[PDB]
Amino acid sequence: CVMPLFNLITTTQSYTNSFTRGVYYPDKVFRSSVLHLTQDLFLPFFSNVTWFHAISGTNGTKRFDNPVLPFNDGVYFASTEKSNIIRGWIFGTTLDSKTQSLLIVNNATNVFIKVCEFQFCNDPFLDVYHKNNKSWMESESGVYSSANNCTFEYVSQPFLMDLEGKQGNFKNLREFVFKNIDGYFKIYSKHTPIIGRDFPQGFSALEPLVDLPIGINITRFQTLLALNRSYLTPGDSSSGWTAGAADYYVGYLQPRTFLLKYNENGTITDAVDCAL
Amino acid sequence: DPLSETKCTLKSFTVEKGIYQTSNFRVQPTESIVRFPNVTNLCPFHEVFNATRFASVYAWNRTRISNCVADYSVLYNFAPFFAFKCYGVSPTKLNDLCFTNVYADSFVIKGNEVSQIAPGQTGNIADYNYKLPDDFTGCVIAWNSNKLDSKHSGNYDYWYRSFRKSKLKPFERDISTEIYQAGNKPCKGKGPNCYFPLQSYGFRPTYGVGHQPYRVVVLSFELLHAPATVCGPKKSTNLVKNKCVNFNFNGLTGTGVLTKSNKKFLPFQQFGRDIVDTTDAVRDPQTLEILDITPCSFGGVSVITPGTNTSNQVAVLYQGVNCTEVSVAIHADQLTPTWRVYSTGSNVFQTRAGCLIGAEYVNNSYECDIPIGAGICASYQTQ
Amino acid sequence: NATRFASVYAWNRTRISNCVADYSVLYNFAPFFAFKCYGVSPTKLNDL
Amino acid sequence: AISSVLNDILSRLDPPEAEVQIDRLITGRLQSLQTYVTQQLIRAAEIR
Amino acid sequence: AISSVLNDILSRLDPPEAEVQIDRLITGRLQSLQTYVTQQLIRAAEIR
Amino acid sequence: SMTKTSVDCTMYICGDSTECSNLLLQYGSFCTQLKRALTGIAVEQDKNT
Amino acid sequence: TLADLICAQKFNGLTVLPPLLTDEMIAQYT
Numbered sequence: 001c002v003m004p005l006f007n008l009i010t011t012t013q014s015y016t017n018s019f020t021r022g023v024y025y026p027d028k029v030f031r032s033s034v035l036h037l038t039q040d041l042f043l044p045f046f047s048n049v050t051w052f053h054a055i056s057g058t059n060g061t062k063r064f065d066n067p068v069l070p071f072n073d074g075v076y077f078a079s080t081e082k083s084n085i086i087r088g089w090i091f092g093t094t095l096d097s098k099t100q101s102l103l104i105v106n107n108a109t110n111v112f113i114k115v116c117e118f119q120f121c122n123d124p125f126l127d128v129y130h131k132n133n134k135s136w137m138e139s140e141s142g143v144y145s146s147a148n149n150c151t152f153e154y155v156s157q158p159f160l161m162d163l164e165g166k167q168g169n170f171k172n173l174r175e176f177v178f179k180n181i182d183g184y185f186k187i188y189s190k191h192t193p194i195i196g197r198d199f200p201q202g203f204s205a206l207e208p209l210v211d212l213p214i215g216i217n218i219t220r221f222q223t224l225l226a227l228n229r230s231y232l233t234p235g236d237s238s239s240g241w242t243a244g245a246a247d248y249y250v251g252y253l254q255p256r257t258f259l260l261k262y263n264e265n266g267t268i269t270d271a272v273d274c275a276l
Numbered sequence: 277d278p279l280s281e282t283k284c285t286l287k288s289f290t291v292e293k294g295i296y297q298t299s300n301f302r303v304q305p306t307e308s309i310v311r312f313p314n315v316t317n318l319c320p321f322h323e324v325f326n327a328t329r330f331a332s333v334y335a336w337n338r339t340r341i342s343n344c345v346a347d348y349s350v351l352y353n354f355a356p357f358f359a360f361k362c363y364g365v366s367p368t369k370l371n372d373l374c375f376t377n378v379y380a381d382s383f384v385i386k387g388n389e390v391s392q393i394a395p396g397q398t399g400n401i402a403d404y405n406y407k408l409p410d411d412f413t414g415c416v417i418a419w420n421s422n423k424l425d426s427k428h429s430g431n432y433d434y435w436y437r438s439f440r441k442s443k444l445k446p447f448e449r450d451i452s453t454e455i456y457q458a459g460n461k462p463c464k465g466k467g468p469n470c471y472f473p474l475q476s477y478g479f480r481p482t483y484g485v486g487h488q489p490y491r492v493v494v495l496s497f498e499l500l501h502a503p504a505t506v507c508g509p510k511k512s513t514n515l516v517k518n519k520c521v522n523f524n525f526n527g528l529t530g531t532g533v534l535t536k537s538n539k540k541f542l543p544f545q546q547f548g549r550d551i552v553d554t555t556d557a558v559r560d561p562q563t564l565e566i567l568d569i570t571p572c573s574f575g576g577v578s579v580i581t582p583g584t585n586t587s588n589q590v591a592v593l594y595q596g597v598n599c600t601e602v603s604v605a606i607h608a609d610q611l612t613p614t615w616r617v618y619s620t621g622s623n624v625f626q627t628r629a630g631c632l633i634g635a636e637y638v639n640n641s642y643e644c645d646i647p648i649g650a651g652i653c654a655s656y657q658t659q
Numbered sequence: 660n661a662t663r664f665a666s667v668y669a670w671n672r673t674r675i676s677n678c679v680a681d682y683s684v685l686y687n688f689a690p691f692f693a694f695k696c697y698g699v700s701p702t703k704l705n706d707l
Numbered sequence: 708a709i710s711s712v713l714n715d716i717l718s719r720l721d722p723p724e725a726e727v728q729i730d731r732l733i734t735g736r737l738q739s740l741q742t743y744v745t746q747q748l749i750r751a752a753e754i755r
Numbered sequence: 756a757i758s759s760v761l762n763d764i765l766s767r768l769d770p771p772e773a774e775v776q777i778d779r780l781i782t783g784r785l786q787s788l789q790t791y792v793t794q795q796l797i798r799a800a801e802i803r
Numbered sequence: 804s805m806t807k808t809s810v811d812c813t814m815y816i817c818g819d820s821t822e823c824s825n826l827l828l829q830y831g832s833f834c835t836q837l838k839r840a841l842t843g844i845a846v847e848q849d850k851n852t
Numbered sequence: 853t854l855a856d857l858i859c860a861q862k863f864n865g866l867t868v869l870p871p872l873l874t875d876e877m878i879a880q881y882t
């Protein structure tokens with residue numbers, strides 16, 4: 001838990017509107033050319049959602065915003081970034097070694113998920129560094145000091161996420177939905193391309209990614225940003241840790257009834273929010 | 277025969293001229309096929325039920341059982357069972373089901389506290405240590421462990437929460453050591469209106485049977501037929517298509533024909549449902565293919581008779597089916613009504629009302645006598 | 660906590676009325692071999 | 708059911724045992740509504 | 756009942772315990788059938 | 804006229820199940836009444852036309 | 853237009869009986 005001194009900027013929680021984003025698949029059941037009325041934890045249409053920016057300024061002040069945030073019944077997380085600064089998330093009630101905590105981390109080769117009484121630092125983070133000026137690697141030493149009484153470990157999803165490039169704008173609308181249902185930590189996701197710059201208008205159903213039967217209690221969550229040991233912006237001789245530009249929107253799920261339209265293909269194409 | 281069925285429906289020995297909706301025909305299944313996944317490794321039930329040490333009741337050990345074959349005959353090997361109470365599922369059927377996931381909540385309690393492990397129960401252990409959900413489905417197995425959890429000087433390693441501000445919610449574990457407070461005066465230590473929530477059991481072999489330590493394992497199942505996962509120990513059978521069969525896809529039991537389809541399942545999708553929430557397609561666990569399910573042909577059966585007076589001859593209308601389907605079912609002997617009416621070759625006639633057997637089609641046109649339907653009528657005539 | 664209890668065939672009847680029924684007192688000297696409530700849930704006795 | 712009032716059933720019994728009385732009331736009131744609507748349909752046919 | 760699928764009830768429960776759910780389903784589906792038949796009769800009178 | 808429908812009471816309530824069929828036999832002649840009503844409706848539709 | 857929904861209905865004991873007079877016969881009468 002070593003963190004070099006930075007001119008940290010107090011987090012500014014901007015406000016934007018959610019449009020019709022954040023619609024996922026309620027269940028594994030296949031449906032064709034049907035209209036289904038389903039009650040579930042959905043993101044309400046046109047509700048306002050909070051906006052954070054994680055960037056390093058040109059004047060030496062780096063906006064390292066990772067506030068602790070409530071979880072409630074669920075979370076919708078939209079991310080736009082180029083260097084994969086958003087590397088993972090933490091979940092737990094006390095975020096200490098007294099109670100079991102959940103951690104999701106990108107290893108840059110695989111995806112790591114742990115459920116252990118982690119002794120997290122004050123602001124856990126991943127250390128990305130360039131060894132020998134030849135190999136870039138990420139380490140978890142800055143996340144937790146020790147792990148004990150581990151009950152679940154899951155190393156899987158050998159996917160590098162964004163691989164097509166940065167054609168439109170980073171080609172990285174990463175939409176995720178995290179829910180706690182019957183002890184199951186459910187992640188739905190969708191990798192939407194970009195028409196515009198930020199939060200394009202449109203509909204994109206979030207295909208489920210992973211159900212983890214962790215069976216733990218979560219009432220709080222936080223974002224983990226990537227810190228790289230310099231050599232990111234060409235022409236800058238400032239030898240110090242810098243973070244790439246990234247934006248992320250957070251919305252909260254509520255119990256809502258939605259009318260979803262499945263076409264003949266089997267995919268959700270449209271949705272109606274019954275109490276909008 | 278059809279005429280006797282008509283008489284029974286009319287509850288009379290004489291039948292008037294007309295067409296009578298007597299019964300319903302069904303095509304019976306020919307084979308029974310089950311499809312269980314490639315998993316062969318047994319579930320670690322022996323480790324759970326034969327562990328060296330068991331956690332305290334207030335710190336009950338939740339073991340995750342998934343992605344394995346759950347053979348419940350192994351649980352019968354070490355069966356000193358004092359309680360084998362299965363709620364929501366018959367124990368004898370446990371070997372024929374596939375469970376989405378298994379949670380083994382294992383702990384140690386007193387002998388007299390076994391009855392508290394049940395839905396809707398109240399007590400010290402039920403309210404402050406381990407509370408079952410109201411809609412709990414699964415089994416509870418309690419067996420004596422005096423020879424392993426007792427000491428001559430007293431086994432104090434087992435503790436139970438005796439005092440708590442509020443009763444524990446279902447599937448909630450409390451490990452806090454805060455001193456219980458009675459009233460509004462804060463408690464800074466042991467004293468009046470202040471008691472330690474955790475009390476040691478102190479199990480001893482010399483104690484009575486009701487006070488002997490008992491190991492209790494609650495096996496909770498989530499009986500949903502979609503993620504499959506933990507299936508029972510049943511041998512799989514090769515898949516057969518284009519035939520009315522009794523299929524068992526990962527515990528999803530049904531009857532019908534299975535056919536190759538174009539229902540483009542997404543990678544996470546397992547089975548499909550119709551507009552009215554009826555299972556339309558299934559996924560083969562082994563070959564990972566999509567299969568439309570079509571229930572075996574059934575329908576009404578009407579008996580055209582010229583009356584008991586004129587003759588005992590009858591015709592049979594199988595409503596809303598091909599004549600070829602009925603002929604195939606008869607050839608393989610799959611029709612539910614087993615009184616097959618003799619068919620010559622000119623007797624079988626295909627109407628839009630169904631398949632008509634036993635009536636000869638004449639290229640004439642008379643006034644309707646017995647209305648069969650779709651413009652076709654029948655009559656007893658000299659030909 | 661009566662010193663002496665009546666016989667079962669001559670069961671003692673006590674009339675409790677015109678007082679606040681605080682059931683938390685019962686939980687103090689509560690061996691509680693059986694606490695079976697018929698027609699009313701025992702947990703709701705504190706609000707009725 | 709023990710009481711015709713929904714509130715009393717909810718305030719006197721725990722959900723697992725209250726649900727039975729709730730369902731008894733539900734069945735009775737569903738039958739009453741169905742009878743009313745059927746009679747209304749027949750009377751509306753006569754009035755038409 | 757515990758499920759709207761009859762096969763699940765027959766496969767997960769013993770006859771004496773499955774009979775309760777089977778009877779619940781029988782009552783519900785019988786009521787649905789009589790409702791449908793009554794509405795059909797009234798509509799048939801209108802069409803006549 | 805309207806659509807003539809036929810409903811199998813046994814298949815609708817207790818589809819291809821013998822336990823459910825035996826339990827349904829204890830409810831009397833409800834299914835026979837439903838079949839009679841639907842048949843009367845169908846014959847009435849043909850008569851109307 | 854007369855009235856998958858039809859397959860689903862036909863799949864639990866609900867069948868539809870064809871009218872005795874075909875539309876050709878109704879046209880002939882008219």
Ligand SMILES: *[C@@H]1O[C@H](CO)[C@@H](O[C@@H]2O[C@H](CO)[C@@H](O)[C@H](O)[C@H]2NC(C)=O)[C@H](O)[C@H]1NC(C)=O
Binds near residue numbers: 264265540
């Ligand atoms: C449903 O999915 C199928 C399978 O991909 C799509 O069929 C393709 O459609 C495109 C666009 O018309 C054609 O060029 C391809 O030849 C089709 N493939 C096949 C195998 O037929 C179909 O288009 C999808 N439905 C929609 C509305 O896009």
Ligand SMILES: *[C@@H]1O[C@H](CO)[C@@H](O[C@@H]2O[C@H](CO)[C@@H](O)[C@H](O)[C@H]2NC(C)=O)[C@H](O)[C@H]1NC(C)=O
Binds near residue numbers: 320323327337338339
């Ligand atoms: C509580 O259960 C866990 C999970 O089963 C036990 O941890 C190990 O689990 C593995 C996998 O089933 C077993 O092979 C080991 O034998 C278990 N024990 C150890 C020490 O590794 C854990 O031991 C259980 N604790 C108690 C007190 O029963």
Ligand SMILES: *[C@@H]1O[C@H](CO)[C@@H](O[C@@H]2O[C@H](CO)[C@@H](O)[C@H](O)[C@H]2NC(C)=O)[C@H](O)[C@H]1NC(C)=O
Binds near residue numbers: 598599600626
């Ligand atoms: C009974 O089934 C047969 C066989 O499928 C159907 O006859 C087919 O009709 C189509 C459409 O005209 C033809 O292309 C096929 O060649 C026919 N098959 C044979 C084997 O002759 C027939 O239509 C079915 N009966 C009804 C009433 O639909």
Ligand SMILES: *[C@@H]1O[C@H](CO)[C@@H](O[C@@H]2O[C@H](CO)[C@@H](O)[C@H](O)[C@H]2NC(C)=O)[C@H](O)[C@H]1NC(C)=O
Binds near residue numbers: 661671
């Ligand atoms: C049942 O026993 C109780 C005591 O346990 C009796 O209540 C007492 O009644 C006397 C009558 O003179 C009072 O003076 C006392 O104050 C009461 N309380 C106590 C604690 O003694 C009650 O009368 C008995 N009932 C019957 C029917 O015998």
Ligand SMILES: *[C@@H]1O[C@H](CO)[C@@H](O)[C@H](O)[C@H]1NC(C)=O
Binds near residue numbers: 015047048
């Ligand atoms: C959400 O916040 C926006 C921005 O301030 C505001 O205009 C809007 O009314 C808010 N919506 C609700 C439902 O509070």
Ligand SMILES: *[C@@H]1O[C@H](CO)[C@@H](O)[C@H](O)[C@H]1NC(C)=O
Binds near residue numbers: 218445
């Ligand atoms: C989860 O933890 C929070 C925070 O301590 C607590 O308020 C809540 O009651 C816990 N939930 C359960 C089900 O134990």
Ligand SMILES: *[C@@H]1O[C@H](CO)[C@@H](O)[C@H](O)[C@H]1NC(C)=O
Binds near residue numbers: 107109110138139140
């Ligand atoms: C990340 O992946 C490497 C292999 O690429 C593996 O050895 C390591 O354990 C993983 N986890 C880390 C570095 O936390």
Ligand SMILES: *[C@@H]1O[C@H](CO)[C@@H](O)[C@H](O)[C@H]1NC(C)=O
Binds near residue numbers: 097148149
């Ligand atoms: C882990 O479990 C042990 C044994 O119950 C306990 O003493 C300890 O506090 C727990 N936590 C850690 C971080 O070791």
Ligand SMILES: *[C@@H]1O[C@H](CO)[C@@H](O)[C@H](O)[C@H]1NC(C)=O
Binds near residue numbers: 322326328354
């Ligand atoms: C249970 O564990 C004990 C102690 O290790 C061992 O001796 C015994 O063989 C085990 N029994 C079974 C059935 O595995």
Ligand SMILES: *[C@@H]1O[C@H](CO)[C@@H](O)[C@H](O)[C@H]1NC(C)=O
Binds near residue numbers: 314561562563564
């Ligand atoms: C199951 O095993 C069979 C036989 O070896 C094999 O053909 C099939 O691919 C396997 N399926 C999976 C999902 O591994």
Ligand SMILES: *[C@@H]1O[C@H](CO)[C@@H](O)[C@H](O)[C@H]1NC(C)=O
Binds near residue numbers: 585
């Ligand atoms: C047939 O019915 C007629 C009346 O239509 C009656 O006279 C006769 O006795 C009946 N039986 C026979 C065998 O003709």
Ligand SMILES: *[C@@H]1O[C@H](CO)[C@@H](O)[C@H](O)[C@H]1NC(C)=O
Binds near residue numbers: 661
């Ligand atoms: C109960 O009665 C016993 C026996 O007389 C006495 O010692 C004890 O103090 C009494 N307790 C209370 C709470 O009155």
